[PDB]
């Protein structure tokens, strides 16, 4: 998920501009739901995932808000001590404590029912048990028992009218999430929200801790500790699930890292490029970042240095010259199925080869499979989410930095060979593989483009529509599931706020019993594909002015 | 009036709710959601509570068991029970709104029932505040804030120690899965904090 917030000093013909592209995969009917609420202290417009009571994306005419996944480390595993005799007990603070348990019956359409037990300790629900060690793992979340309060903080924030009121709500959102703020005066802000544990000294958050007592968290860290910025010196706020601040530790996921190779750089480059940006220019960053190869920038210097003393008739040198001539922006050919330049295909084969010779070689099986992905892997339906730099690729970047990298190289990944020789060997592999499929004339290589699929199954793999309801877009776009833009104090209007969004396929997922599809079932699908957008209405006169229907209810509690 | 809920849809079908109190405001929201996205919402309710095998069968038993083992329902009910009446209205308003529309659908299924209920062979049930809360808990708290690989990390670390010896195994672990990397591009500039 990405976000860019532009303040007074960076905005052109407005005081503040907010562009959000939450990334949750592509689904039919739409992941989010458009809604405006006017009454009981609320006056909002926007869209939100699964029609939650609180709007994750929108504005109230005074302030605007948005979000991106935080990825802080808020979950730790406790290795619970069991006794072989006295079962359903665990040792805690020198006493054998009894576990909470619950039985569950799974009813099955056309099969027998199934029952099982769920166990819980002071630390959390039991994940797995090792009856050979006599160890049970309990998953401990810092937000345990604040789930409901997080929902309500997301609802109450819609009523804030300033930063002061807004942060009182940010302090109650307990999940690891980045929150963003903009207002009619041009003020902009950011908060890395969430509940984080106050760990015992010498607790390594990447690995399990004994749950017998000494390793128990001291409590939770105060909100004064949560990374935050208000009216930053740069004039803008950018995030693409990158680190909030210097020395902030990421999630413990082996596959997740915050290193020198980060896709947020692609946003920063574009925002620093122009002294001021207009709303069209801010919107336009979606199109560029949607199409940008994420590896070009990181390894082009490395490939250039390695092929500098090679001959023009040398195919490994040719491949590097192709990439040098390229801007990294993927464009479809007229055929709607292949890309204009072979760059991504080259980087994909090269990177796979490089990983196999370096990172993969240094790790024991089967842990080696965790580092072999190049990050181009997809299927026929295309990627299921956003494109990122793979973990293996982030680790190889630090290695190619040599001594400029802050990460101590305990094992030399190049295994005593000069870098240039491993790079040229991978380039030979690349050429051998690609030339075999497409021929020798690099100029006529017609490489396959990634596509986009609006899936009928929700993110859990559960049908939320009929299979036939699946939609296909020819061009894969590395962008939000939805995109929304809020412009405060346009110089261009009489209106103090202007907002736009796109909720594809459409607002409604309704299909009548006869097979008659709603009028708003898919009227936003083409708009999505060509980077279009629809106006969001807040005031009564705009809403009235654009009404298509009215329904009045008389209900009493 | 206080009993009145006005629902205006725009040129894209986006609903706008005009109401005087909290219960009436969330009732309006609940109602349009049941109009627009009932099958989706229904499937989202079964996904977040682990009740898919009931209507879909054998293939979802493992899924259903995995969902149920990852939460404590009773802990969620206790947080609901502790809400203030204004907070409670949001959740109750919403569930009531939805129910209002589920009653008409279930009353006149020859024209109001979403085609997929017929396809899948089942029908919509009424909602309670717990169901609304579970939609958020299951797709926001478990989707984006429940990430750990600690047991797996330990497995990896153990294999690095068996390969490079104990101190070496540990330094390689720090090269692959570092805690922090001071060169990581950050949202907040270093001058700020
Ligand atoms: Ca952890």
């Amino acid at each position: 998920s990405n976000m860019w917030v532009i303040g007074k000093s960076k905005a052109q013909d407005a005081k503040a501009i907010m562009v959000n592209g939450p990334q949750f995969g592509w689904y039919a009917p739409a992941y989010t739901y458009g809604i405006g609420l006017h009454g009981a202290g609320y006056d909002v417009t926007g869209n939100t995932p699964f029609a939650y009571p609180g709007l994750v994306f929108g504005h109230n005419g005074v302030i605007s808000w948005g979000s991106t996944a935080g990825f802080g480390d808020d979950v730790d595993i406790f290795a619970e001590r069991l006794s072989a005799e006295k079962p359903g007990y665990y040792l805690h603070n020198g006493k054998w404590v009894k576990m909470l348990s619950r039985e569950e019956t799974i009813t099955v359409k056309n099969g027998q029912a199934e029952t099982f037990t769920v166990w819980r300790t002071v630390h959390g629900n039991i994940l797995q048990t090792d009856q050979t060690t006599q160890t049970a793992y309990a998953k401990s979340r810092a937000w345990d028992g604040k789930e409901v309060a997080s929902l309500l903080a997301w609802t109450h924030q819609m009523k804030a009218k300033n930063w002061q009121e807004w942060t009182q709500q940010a302090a109650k959102q307990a999940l690891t999430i980045n929150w963003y703020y903009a207002d009619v005066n041009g003020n902009i802000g950011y908060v890395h929200t969430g509940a984080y544990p106050d760990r015992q000294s010498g607790h390594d958050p990447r690995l399990p801790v004994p749950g017998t007592g000494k390793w128990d968290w001291k409590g939770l860290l105060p909100f004064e500790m949560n990374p935050k910025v208000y009216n930053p010196q740069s004039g803008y706020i950018a995030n693409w699930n990158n680190s909030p601040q210097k020395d902030y530790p990421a999630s413990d996921l082996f596959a997740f890292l915050w290193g020198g190779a980060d896709r947020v750089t692609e946003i920063d480059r574009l925002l620093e490029q122009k002294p001021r940006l207009t709303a069209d220019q801010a919107w336009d960053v979606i199109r560029q970042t949607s199409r940008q190869d994420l590896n070009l920038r990181l390894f082009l210097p490395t490939l250039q240095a390695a092929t500098s003393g090679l001959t023009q008739s040398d195919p490994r040198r040719q491949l590097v010259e192709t990439l040098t001539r390229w801007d990294g922006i993927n464009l479809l050919n007229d055929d709607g199925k292949t890309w204009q330049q072979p760059g991504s295909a080259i980087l994909n084969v090269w990177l796979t080869s490089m990983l196999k010779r370096t990172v993969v070689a240094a790790v024991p099986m089967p842990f080696d499979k965790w580092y072999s992905a190049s990050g181009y892997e997809t299927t026929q339906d295309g990627p299921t989410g956003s494109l990122n730099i793979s973990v293996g690729a982030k680790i190889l970047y630090e290695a190619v930095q040599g001594d400029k990298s802050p990460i101590p190289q305990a094992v030399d990944l190049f295994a005593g060979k000069p870098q240039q020789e491993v790079v040229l060997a991978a380039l030979e592999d690349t050429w051998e593989t690609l030339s075999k499929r497409y021929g020798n004339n690099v100029s006529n290589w017609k490489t396959p483009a990634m596509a986009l699929t609006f899936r009928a199954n929700n993110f859990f793999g559960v049908p939320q529509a009929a299979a036939e309801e699946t939609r296909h877009q020819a061009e894969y776009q590395n962008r939000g599931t939805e995109n929304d833009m809020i412009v405060f104090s346009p110089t261009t209007s009489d209106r103090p706020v202007l907002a736009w969004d796109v909720v594809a396929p459409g607002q409604s997922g309704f299909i009548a019993p006869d097979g008659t599809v709603d009028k708003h079932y898919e009227d936003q699908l083409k708009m999505y594909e060509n980077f279009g957008r629809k106006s969001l209405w807040l005031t009564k006169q705009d809403v009235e002015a654009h009404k298509e229907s009215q329904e009045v209810l008389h209900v009493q509690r | 009036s206080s009993s009145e809920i006005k629902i205006v849809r725009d040129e894209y079908g986006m609903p706008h709710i005009y109401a005087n109190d909290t219960w009436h405001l969330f009732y309006g929201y609940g109602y349009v959601v049941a109009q627009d996205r009932l099958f989706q919402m229904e499937m989202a309710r079964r996904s977040t509570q682990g009740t898919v095998a009931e209507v879909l069968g054998k293939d979802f038993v493992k899924f259903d068991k995995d969902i149920r083992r990852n939460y404590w329902p009773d802990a969620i009910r206790a947080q609901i029970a502790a809400l203030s009446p204004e907070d409670m209205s949001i959740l109750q308003g919403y569930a009531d709104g939805m129910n209002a529309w589920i009653d008409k659908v279930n009353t006149n299924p020859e024209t109001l029932l979403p085609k997929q209920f017929n396809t899948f062979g089942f029908t919509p049930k009424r909602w309670e505040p717990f169901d609304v809360a579970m939609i958020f808990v299951g797709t926001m708290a478990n989707r984006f804030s429940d990430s750990t690989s600690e047991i797996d990390n330990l497995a990896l670390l153990t294999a690095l120690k068996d390969k490079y010896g104990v101190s070496q195994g540990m330094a390689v672990f720090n090269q692959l899965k570092w805690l922090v990397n001071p060169s990581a591009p950050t949202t907040i500039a270093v001058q700020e904090s």
Side-chain angles (χ1 to χ4, degrees):
Chain A
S1 302
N2 51 215
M3 173 74 92
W4 44 104
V5 199
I6 296 142
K8 267 166 289 219
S9 76
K10 255 265 191 257
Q12 180 56 50
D13 293 326
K15 284 209 170 158
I17 307 157
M18 174 182 283
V19 186
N20 205 174
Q23 289 181 294
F24 308 99
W26 291 269
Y27 310 88
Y31 192 80
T32 76
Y33 186 88
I35 182 86
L37 310 160
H38 319 274
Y42 297 100
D43 201 31
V44 304
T45 12
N47 76 71
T48 194
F50 292 94
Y52 305 138
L55 278 60
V56 178
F57 329 101
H59 69 101
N60 67 15
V62 176
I63 77 154
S64 55
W65 59 84
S67 250
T68 67
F71 286 96
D73 185 348
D74 64 354
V75 179
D76 297 341
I77 300 211
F78 286 80
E80 302 297 14
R81 173 80 141 86
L82 320 169
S83 49
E85 336 156 333
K86 277 259 148 208
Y89 282 81
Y90 67 94
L91 185 85
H92 191 241
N93 283 148
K95 312 168 81 195
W96 288 83
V97 184
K98 215 214 193 283
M99 283 173 174
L100 307 181
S101 63
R102 87 170 190 267
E103 261 194 8
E104 288 284 338
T105 304
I106 315 295
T107 300
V108 189
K109 166 80 155 211
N110 290 144
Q112 250 168 1
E114 285 198 29
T115 106
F116 66 105
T117 309
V118 180
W119 292 90
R120 164 176 191 100
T121 74
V122 62
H123 303 115
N125 291 12
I126 299 320
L127 263 163
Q128 43 176 106
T129 69
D130 186 2
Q131 350 137 341
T132 85
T133 349
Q134 292 290 343
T135 304
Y137 291 98
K139 178 167 47 157
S140 172
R141 308 139 161 163
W143 49 264
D144 196 346
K146 297 160 196 260
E147 299 80 338
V148 174
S150 300
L151 210 198
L152 291 175
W154 234 307
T155 313
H156 298 135
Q157 61 100 32
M158 299 191 283
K159 307 177 191 155
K161 288 195 162 215
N162 62 36
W163 173 259
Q164 325 168 329
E165 299 178 3
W166 189 79
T167 60
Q168 286 168 16
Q169 295 310 312
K172 303 193 202 151
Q173 204 300 109
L175 311 181
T176 182
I177 313 282
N178 295 306
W179 276 16
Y180 312 80
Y181 178 103
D183 67 34
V184 218
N185 302 304
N187 302 300
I188 66 175
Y190 167 68
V191 187
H192 176 82
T193 80
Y196 298 102
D198 181 2
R199 303 193 174 79
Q200 274 325 316
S201 226
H203 182 153
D204 176 356
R206 298 172 302 178
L207 298 145
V209 286
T212 66
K214 313 64 183 295
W215 291 105
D216 293 351
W217 310 328
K218 294 181 215 160
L220 308 172
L221 299 171
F223 180 71
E224 170 154 288
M225 308 266 271
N226 293 68
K228 61 192 134 289
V229 240
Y230 181 69
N231 275 351
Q233 315 168 5
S234 42
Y236 78 89
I237 295 147
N239 185 278
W240 200 347
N241 311 125
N242 60 284
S243 173
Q245 171 189 79
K246 203 189 144 192
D247 288 327
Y248 192 98
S251 176
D252 68 51
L253 284 175
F254 62 75
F256 190 93
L257 297 173
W258 288 326
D262 198 288
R263 59 176 184 198
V264 69
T265 305
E266 294 310 335
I267 296 167
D268 299 313
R269 329 177 182 161
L270 290 176
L271 314 166
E272 284 163 29
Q273 258 190 35
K274 274 155 320 216
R276 276 167 175 279
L277 303 93
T278 64
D280 292 327
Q281 290 169 343
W283 185 263
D284 210 61
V285 177
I286 297 164
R287 182 172 50 62
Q288 299 161 94
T289 66
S290 274
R291 285 166 171 174
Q292 185 52 249
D293 174 288
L294 301 181
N295 301 290
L296 186 60
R297 183 183 53 84
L298 307 174
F299 309 101
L300 187 63
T302 295
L303 292 160
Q304 279 170 339
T307 63
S308 72
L310 313 188
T311 54
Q312 182 207 243
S313 70
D314 193 344
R316 302 170 299 174
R317 163 136 212 47
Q318 277 178 61
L319 288 187
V320 176
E321 255 182 30
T322 296
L323 299 177
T324 299
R325 278 187 256 107
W326 196 38
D327 57 11
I329 297 294
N330 278 316
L331 293 173
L332 291 166
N333 274 307
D334 278 321
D335 65 1
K337 27 179 314 210
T338 73
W339 270 327
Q340 282 188 12
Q341 319 299 304
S344 295
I346 296 161
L347 288 162
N348 175 211
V349 177
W350 180 77
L351 209 50
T352 302
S353 175
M354 292 290 285
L355 294 173
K356 176 165 187 176
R357 296 167 177 288
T358 64
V359 198
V360 169
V363 183
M365 262 157 234
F367 309 106
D368 65 310
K369 256 39 223 158
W370 305 346
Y371 303 97
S372 55
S374 67
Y376 285 92
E377 302 72 15
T378 78
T379 55
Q380 297 176 351
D381 296 321
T384 60
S386 77
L387 255 29
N388 210 355
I389 300 154
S390 68
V391 230
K394 299 186 172 182
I395 298 166
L396 174 75
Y397 180 77
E398 299 297 326
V400 310
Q401 292 307 287
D403 201 9
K404 197 87 178 286
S405 163
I407 312 300
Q409 308 289 302
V411 283
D412 159 44
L413 287 184
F414 296 104
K417 319 186 205 274
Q419 264 195 25
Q420 152 175 22
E421 171 180 329
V422 181
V423 167
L424 297 162
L427 276 176
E428 196 185 309
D429 286 353
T430 308
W431 178 259
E432 179 263 9
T433 293
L434 292 186
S435 69
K436 216 259 189 161
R437 187 192 195 182
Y438 309 106
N440 295 312
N441 184 186
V442 180
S443 279
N444 78 174
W445 282 10
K446 281 196 165 136
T447 61
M450 279 166 303
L452 194 29
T453 304
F454 292 81
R455 298 153 175 82
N457 292 10
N458 67 17
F459 80 80
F460 304 89
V462 180
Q464 66 160 26
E468 338 150 358
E469 296 192 70
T470 300
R471 299 289 159 261
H472 293 285
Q473 173 175 302
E475 189 190 24
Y476 176 87
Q477 289 159 354
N478 188 15
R479 67 187 287 200
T481 300
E482 79 75 45
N483 287 98
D484 67 276
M485 175 163 68
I486 306 99
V487 178
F488 283 104
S489 315
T491 67
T492 62
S493 178
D494 61 3
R495 285 171 202 183
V497 195
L498 297 176
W500 299 263
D501 73 343
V502 51
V503 172
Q507 175 77 23
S508 171
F510 186 62
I511 305 168
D514 70 345
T516 301
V517 147
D518 189 87
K519 131 179 49 188
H520 295 121
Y521 182 78
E522 59 177 87
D523 57 331
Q524 286 187 71
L525 192 63
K526 283 301 149 228
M527 160 178 280
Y528 192 65
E529 149 163 287
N530 28 78
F531 296 99
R533 58 174 143 111
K534 103 188 177 202
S535 277
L536 285 167
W537 311 116
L538 184 76
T539 83
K540 311 202 201 152
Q541 161 205 0
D542 289 331
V543 174
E544 289 315 316
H546 297 89
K547 184 202 324 213
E548 85 157 29
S549 76
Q550 194 166 293
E551 189 165 356
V552 183
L553 309 172
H554 296 94
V555 184
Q556 245 302 337
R557 200 177 188 183
Chain B
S1 204
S2 322
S3 72
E4 185 168 274
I5 304 151
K6 188 214 290 163
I7 306 159
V8 182
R9 282 170 176 289
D10 67 6
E11 11 59 293
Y12 285 93
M14 194 185 146
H16 284 79
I17 320 297
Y18 301 87
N20 286 293
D21 66 12
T22 305
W23 184 90
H24 286 100
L25 192 71
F26 288 96
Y27 178 111
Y29 191 172
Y31 194 74
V32 298
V33 170
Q35 283 188 337
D36 289 338
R37 309 289 179 90
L38 186 71
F39 189 73
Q40 164 187 62
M41 298 287 292
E42 170 66 15
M43 289 318 283
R45 166 169 69 178
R46 298 182 168 271
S47 296
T48 66
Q49 291 184 40
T51 57
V52 184
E54 266 176 19
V55 301
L56 298 191
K58 324 177 169 201
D59 296 335
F60 294 82
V61 172
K62 163 160 164 174
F63 172 84
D64 281 347
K65 304 218 218 219
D66 292 330
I67 296 286
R68 298 195 199 180
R69 285 177 192 188
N70 205 52
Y71 81 125
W72 205 256
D74 290 4
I76 303 292
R77 287 176 187 292
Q79 301 171 47
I80 299 183
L83 295 174
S84 77
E86 174 264 55
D87 282 349
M88 187 50 179
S89 270
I90 304 175
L91 303 193
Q92 206 47 86
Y94 198 108
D96 288 338
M98 279 202 86
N99 281 354
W101 183 266
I102 293 151
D103 288 342
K104 324 201 157 162
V105 164
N106 272 334
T107 265
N108 185 173
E110 348 89 11
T111 42
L112 296 189
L113 183 82
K115 180 158 185 269
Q116 305 91 349
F117 285 105
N118 285 332
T119 306
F120 285 100
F122 70 93
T123 50
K125 288 170 171 304
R126 303 152 62 65
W127 286 62
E128 39 155 359
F130 172 78
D131 298 320
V132 174
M134 280 313 292
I135 295 283
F136 175 81
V137 173
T139 68
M140 184 66 94
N142 305 350
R143 177 151 207 207
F144 290 107
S145 195
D146 192 34
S147 287
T148 20
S149 55
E150 294 178 13
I151 298 159
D152 283 336
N153 298 356
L154 179 76
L156 168 72
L157 176 68
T158 296
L160 296 178
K161 287 180 163 184
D162 282 29
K163 165 121 172 148
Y164 300 105
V166 169
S167 315
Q168 192 61 4
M170 181 69 200
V172 175
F173 185 79
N174 300 320
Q175 194 190 343
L176 302 181
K177 182 40 175 180
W178 53 71
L179 201 27
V180 289
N181 178 338
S183 62
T186 65
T187 295
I188 302 156
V190 277
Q191 322 63 255
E192 312 296 355
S193 73

